[PDB]
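Practice problem. Given the sequence and the SMILES for flavin-adenine dinucleotide, write out the predicted structure.
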Amino acid sequence: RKKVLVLGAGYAGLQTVTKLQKAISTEEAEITLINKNEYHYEATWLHEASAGTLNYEDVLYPVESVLKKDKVNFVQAEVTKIDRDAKKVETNQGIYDFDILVVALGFVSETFGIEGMKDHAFQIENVITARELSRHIEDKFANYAASKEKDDNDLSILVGGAGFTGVEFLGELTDRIPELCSKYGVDQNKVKITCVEAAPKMLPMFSEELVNHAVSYLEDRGVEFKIATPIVACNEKGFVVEVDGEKQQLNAGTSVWAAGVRGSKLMEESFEGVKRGRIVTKQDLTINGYDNIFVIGDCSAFIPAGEERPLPTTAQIAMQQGESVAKNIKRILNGESTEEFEYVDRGTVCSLGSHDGVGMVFGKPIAGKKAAFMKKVIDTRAVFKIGGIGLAFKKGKF
Ligand SMILES: Cc1cc2nc3c(=O)[nH]c(=O)nc-3n(C[C@H](O)[C@H](O)[C@H](O)COP(=O)(O)OP(=O)(O)OC[C@H]3O[C@@H](n4cnc5c(N)ncnc54)[C@H](O)[C@@H]3O)c2cc1C
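Answer key:
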């Protein structure tokens, strides 16, 4: 009865456990799942929870509800050390042994060495950061309404990054800001929403036609874009950016970083050859020198056969990776060889508020209500893929 230890109950880790628990027998192996929180959260819905267009309770569900308790021991604890050679993992609630390890500790903000970006900006990482950010935004509107001063910079928001997460967050701000304006007696014209991207292109994963749709959509709703504009620092006043190489202070009562993520900080402390919290795995998702250690999700850098660069960090690859791991753990336990992971690009949607978006579905570009409907089908299918039709009905987007 080998000990299968899974670190993190996210997309990658919880998918591995729900698939693996159906396939193993109780005497075949012991599964242990460790997670910081009692819940699993839909990290892909944190744009809505951060802006406050969705109640935080609606992005999460208890982990234990989807577990076969005779096969899985759920441990609510924070992982603090991973000893790959002693086959031990230390947490704040004790030390756990393992025969097979699955590292699925997810992501955290990556600020590219930009001074003050962690200290002076709000991140998009989990439910707690999302709750602090939504509360901060409304508190800025409520303080503006209370003051005799009326400093319109309290109503100014900076968003770092014009990629997928940033653009989705801006889409939620365009739904929320009008409501907060009307609730707190503010004229929308006094609000300033600015997106700063160092890169020369916005949403590089989509076509030019699809980017123009998202740009027009957000510009018509007051978003100003500063593309090919490096953010060289973040202070209490806002972002310090370079325009034609000259430094410029941009002022905002709220600064949000959405331009980069990295894998868990436990990765550099635990395994070799890690870059930005990501380890390049073998084709079966194991790591070099360890046929008993799998690393998936945002902690992994899976390079497909025949390619040079790893696939991007997504909930879609994470869930596909968890299924693969569950099937290879079964093979290992029965003395069978592992099979290579093969990512299937199902496509995706970048949301633009509740009733718009840009995406690729079935290899065809989509936008508008069609995209917004497809984003709800994809979000709900991810709830189904982990917890079944019951959980999809209760916690899904329909
Ligand atoms: C707003 C937003 C929108 C996105 N939209 C999309 C989208 O539409 N489609 C898409 O495919 N991807 C999208 N992504 C990316 C996607 O959310 C991530 O790639 C995905 O979360 C990775 O899954 P994961 O299991 O590796 O990590 P996570 O979802 O980050 O889960 C990691 C888990 O481990 C736990 N944990 C972490 N550290 C510890 C520790 N030390 N001890 C114990 N527990 C710990 C966490 O609490 C969490 O439960 C989006 C991301 C954001 C932020």
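Check your answer against the key. The pocket of flavin-adenine dinucleotide is lined by residues 8-13, 34-37, 43-44, 46-47, 78-79, 104-107, 124, 165, 168, 264, 266, 297-298, 313-316, 318, 348 (CB under 6 Å).
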